[PDB]
Design a protein around this ligand. Structure first.
Ligand SMILES: [Mg+2]
Ligand SMILES: [Mg+2]
Ligand SMILES: [Mg+2]
Ligand SMILES: [Mg+2]
Ligand SMILES: [Mg+2]
Ligand SMILES: [Mg+2]
Ligand SMILES: [Mg+2]
Ligand SMILES: [Mg+2]
Ligand SMILES: [Mg+2]
Ligand SMILES: [Mg+2]
Ligand SMILES: [Mg+2]
Ligand SMILES: [Mg+2]
Ligand SMILES: [Mg+2]
Ligand SMILES: [Mg+2]
Ligand SMILES: [Mg+2]
Ligand SMILES: [Mg+2]
Ligand SMILES: [Mg+2]
Ligand SMILES: [Mg+2]
Ligand SMILES: [Mg+2]
Ligand SMILES: [Mg+2]
Lengths: 70, 271, 117, 88, 100, 55
RNA sequence: GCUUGAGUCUCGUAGAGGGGGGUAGAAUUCCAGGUGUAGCGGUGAAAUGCGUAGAGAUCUGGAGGAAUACCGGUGGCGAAGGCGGCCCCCUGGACGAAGACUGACGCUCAGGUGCGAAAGCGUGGGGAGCAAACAGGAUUAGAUACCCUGGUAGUCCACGCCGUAAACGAUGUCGACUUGGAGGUUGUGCCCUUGAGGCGUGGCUUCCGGAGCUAACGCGUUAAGUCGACCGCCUGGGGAGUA
RNA sequence: GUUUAUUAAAAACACAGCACUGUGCAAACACGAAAGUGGACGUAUACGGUGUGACGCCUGCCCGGUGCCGGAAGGUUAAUU
């Protein structure tokens, strides 16, 4: 991630661009991913759980929006 | 190929042979032969200078062209034949002008292949060019230490030299031993590895096999008396000494190289 | 002595310690300061505050060079990732560009095994 | 698989006409044409097991087709094998 | 006898030899009954990343149709020619002659 | 169909740091994304596109 | 005899299918040198360890190995195991379009043969990272562990052997039949200007559900529903997949 | 297979195999005041030294001591001045 700051740009907005540009690239998330080895079985299992959660989340949300609570 | 002998008798159970059907079954090239006599480890004083040498089968030396100065004349490999004088085989080549010579057989060479020597030769195995014109990172064998002196490196059965760097007038070579050495770019080298890479897989199998090739038995220093060897004797099997050579020099670790002349060319030692 | 006007600041943010170093555009180190050596040990150095203090000590270590322009190089995660950079404002230092240089391998080397805590 | 031009020769050489492609003779000849051609492939690609699995299918199909010809017409079967130089 | 797409970058100091190399390479294929379907000299261009401490390279395009051996034997020449760096070849099913 | 030499269009599907934008964002079809990726990787090798912003 | 099962041919399509070779970038480690100075690293805390013989940090150059970020997706391919940079050579299979051809050539399969993760073994290489064993420092009543700093085999390549996994969908293979809804992926016909459209027709695939089935949980056109062909296997627990 | 010719033929020596270590070629090493010679008309799949001793399953822990290897900032230290 690269950000170029001019002479007239106040630091507050310039600083936030780093927090919004680098974080968008996922540097803080990618680095944590390679800190320790997730064994290939773990990768498939966690990805499988995420996929189930992603699909189940929409199913759960869609049904709830059509169901009254009070 | 490697063949394991069937255990039809002791001394034949453990014998492993290297059989090359491509080798010529007939007599060698007579005009390129000469007589070399066994010395038995004796120098001009008659004293045993090096031990464990003696006997063995009679051998006839064959002039092997280690220089390869025939430039611009293509040659064809007539045949591959056994060489008793070295681990590698020798390929008989015929220059189209009518001259025959012996060269070390590269890895993939076979009868009828095209080989050329010179500065403008193609980049193929068996071709000899100065390392100035040879691309870096290419495997070569039979490298000369000095221009025009003849190859002296990577001559064994499966040995080879890797050209790693080329800086100015010197080329740094990764020798088979693992040490890096500097040689002039004008020295010649032969592309490709040396043939008969299976020479290391053979097993002599029996004591007589070593004797056939002129290797006399080696006697341990422990079994010696104190007068003969520093390891000496002792009632029973006693050692109680730092291992040394029969002339008292410490062995098993002691560095021995003391050549201050050419340590400039040794960029890095083997280990 | 050299009186360089433009410099380069390297932030080696890490989960344990934060190292702040100031170097010219050519990468020749001028001065450095670290959280561990700033009176913080153990859990103390790990906090973001230790990162900002280390930045302050870095400014004094290079005030004799009289540098004005700075390049903030940031590597690795840690609470000192953002605290240290903001500390340069307390010193009034001027910067020209900010970039992320955290190593991101394309697989390759074997990462160490997980810790069964 | 097999070159289109090479396939054309076999269908005409072994088939009744240039349009009869389903005849048991052309199928056996076509399978034999590919089977022997793969000797060079497996001469040096010895561990290429996955494609060898397809080769054994060709061998099995050829065996099945030949047995069918034997039950239908023995005389016609004999001519096919001698011309193709198989069943050794 | 298939369609091929060849791209090769040469040392900028050798920008004066590129017309010569094109003729030699084109001659080799045409001698084997091949034919060139597209030729384009892209000029010196800025490199995305440095190669061997070098930042500018001369780009050319060469889409050809020739037998296996001539390209195979052409690859080996590409290897030892120090002027050319990082050449690529590709397989295509139909000849293409576009400006691109 | 997508050509690696069609370099003008490639930045529309890569970020500043050289990331390849996922299909979920760009909305490209699955088939085109596969060939698009091959084109991008092909261009990067020829130094036409950068692998990353650091070199 | 016949053409609907099965198969052949022509034209195309997608794909980490496989084997061989080459090459590219990021990163770690190591080596050399420059800037620079007292810490670095690590943990819940700490120590062992590394460092004034100049570490760590930072820059330049070089050597070498291994794996391919983003793309990337209950996405794709393969009989299974399994297979992810890019490029070339050799090659298996699947699928669609219409047309032609052969004319039951089919299904299953004891024994048999082949393939078969990881670990392991044999020989010869290679070895950056990681890491059984091992060593030390912690923790604890003890700690032959969990944690930390090091670290060998191994992990990699060539060829052979081993033939075992929760080798799982805990569900043998083939064929027919039986209400649906929402997606993914890959072909194809038609309507076409009212397209980042509209209606059909195939392959593979994910999720939820009807009848029915089931001890229940659940399965549910990809059946664990309704049938047919063939094979494998089970007969209380332990002893024992042991002698 | 070898050995105390002339009281010991053996479990001793050798042995193929294995391992460590030295050696980049004017190689190490060895015989020579030296020239030179062998190793070798060989070139690390080579050669020397050492221990073990086919093959099979294996070869654990300790570097304080002695030796060897590497570094060497510092202390001490010869001729010379
Ligand atoms: Mg000897
Ligand atoms: Mg011996
Ligand atoms: Mg005795
Ligand atoms: Mg005793
Ligand atoms: Mg750690
Ligand atoms: Mg077929
Ligand atoms: Mg069976
Ligand atoms: Mg394994
Ligand atoms: Mg092994
Ligand atoms: Mg550990
Ligand atoms: Mg089982
Ligand atoms: Mg599995
Ligand atoms: Mg499963
Ligand atoms: Mg089962
Ligand atoms: Mg259901
Ligand atoms: Mg048993
Ligand atoms: Mg006697
Ligand atoms: Mg007697
Ligand atoms: Mg003994
Ligand atoms: Mg021991």
């Amino acid at each position: 991630p690269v950000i170029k700051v001019r002479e007239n740009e106040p630091f507050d907005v310039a600083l936030r661009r780093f927090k919004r540009s680098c974080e968008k690239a996922g540097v803080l998330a990618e680095v944590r991913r390679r800190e320790f080895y997730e064994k290939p079985t773990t990768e498939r299992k966690r990805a499988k759980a995420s996929a189930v959660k992603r699909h189940a989340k929409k199913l759960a949300r869609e049904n709830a929006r059509r169901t009254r609570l009070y | 190929a490697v063949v394991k002998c069937k255990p039809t008798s002791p001394g034949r159970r453990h014998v492993v042979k290297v059989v090359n059907p491509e080798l010529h079954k007939g007599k060698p090239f007579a005009p390129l032969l000469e007589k070399n006599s066994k010395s038995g480890g004796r120098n001009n004083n008659g004293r045993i200078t090096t031990r464990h040498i003696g006997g063995g089968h009679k051998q006839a030396y064959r002039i092997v062209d280690f220089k390869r100065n025939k430039d611009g004349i293509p040659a064809v490999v007539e045949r591959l034949e056994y060489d008793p004088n070295r681990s590698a085989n020798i390929a008989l080549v015929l220059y189209k002008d009518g001259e025959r010579r012996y060269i070390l057989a590269p890895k993939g060479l076979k009868a009828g292949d095209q080989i050329q020597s010179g500065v403008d030769a193609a980049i193929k195995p068996g071709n000899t060019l100065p390392m100035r014109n040879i691309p870096v990172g290419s495997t070569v064998h039979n490298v000369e230490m000095k221009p025009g002196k003849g190859g002296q490196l990577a001559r064994s059965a499966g040995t080879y030299v890797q050209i790693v760097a080329r800086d100015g007038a010197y080329v740094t070579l990764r020798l088979r031993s693992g040490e890096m050495r500097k040689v002039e770019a004008d020295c010649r080298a032969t592309l490709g590895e040396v043939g008969n890479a299976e020479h290391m897989l053979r097993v002599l199998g029996k004591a007589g096999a070593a004797r056939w090739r002129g290797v006399r038995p080696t006697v341990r220093g422990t079994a010696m008396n104190p007068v003969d060897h520093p390891h000496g004797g002792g009632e029973g099997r006693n050692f109680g000494k730092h291992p040394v050579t029969p002339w008292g020099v410490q062995t098993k670790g002691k560095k021995t190289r003391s050549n201050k002349r050419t340590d400039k060319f040794i960029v890095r030692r083997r280990s | 002595r050299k009186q360089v006007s433009d410099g380069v600041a390297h932030i080696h943010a890490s989960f344990n310690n934060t190292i702040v170093t100031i170097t010219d555009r050519q990468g020749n180190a001028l001065g450095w300061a670290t959280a561990g050596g700033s009176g913080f040990r153990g859990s103390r150095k790990s906090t973001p505050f230790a990162a900002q203090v280390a930045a302050e000590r870095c400014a004094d270590a290079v005030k004799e060079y009289g540098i004005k322009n700075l390049e903030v190089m940031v590597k690795g995660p840690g609470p000192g990732r953002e605290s240290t950079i903001r500390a340069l404002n307390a010193a009034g230092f001027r910067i020209t560009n900010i970039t992320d240089v955290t190593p991101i391998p394309h697989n390759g080397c074997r990462p160490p095994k997980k810790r069964r805590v | 698989s097999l070159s289109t031009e090479a396939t054309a020769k076999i269908v005409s050489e072994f088939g009744r006409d240039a349009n009869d492609t389903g005849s048991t003779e052309v199928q056996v000849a076509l399978l034999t044409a590919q089977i022997n051609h793969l000797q060079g492939h497996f001469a040096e690609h010895k561990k290429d097991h996955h494609s060898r699995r397809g080769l054994l299918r060709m061998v099995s199909q050829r065996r099945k087709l030949l047995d069918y010809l034997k039950r239908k017409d023995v005389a016609r079967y004999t001519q096919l094998i001698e011309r193709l130089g198989l069943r050794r | 006898m298939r369609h091929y797409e060849i791209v090769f970058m040469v040392h900028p100091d050798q920008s004066e030899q590129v017309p010569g190399m094109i003729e030699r390479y084109t001659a080799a294929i045409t001698g084997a009954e091949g034919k060139i379907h597209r030729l384009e000299d892209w000029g010196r261009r800025q490199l995305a990343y440095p190669i061997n401490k070098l930042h500018k390279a001369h780009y050319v395009l060469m889409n050809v149709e020739a037998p296996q051996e001539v390209i195979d034997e052409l690859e080996t020449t590409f290897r030892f020619n120090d002027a050319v760096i990082r050449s690529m070849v590709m397989r295509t099913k139909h000849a293409v002659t576009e400006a691109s | 169909e997508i050509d690696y030499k069609d370099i003008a269009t490639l930045k529309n599907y890569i970020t500043e740091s050289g990331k390849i934008v996922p299909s979920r964002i760009t909305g490209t079809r699955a088939k085109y994304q596969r060939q698009l990726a091959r084109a991008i990787k092909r261009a990067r090798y020829l130094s036409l596109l950068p692998y990353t912003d650091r070199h």
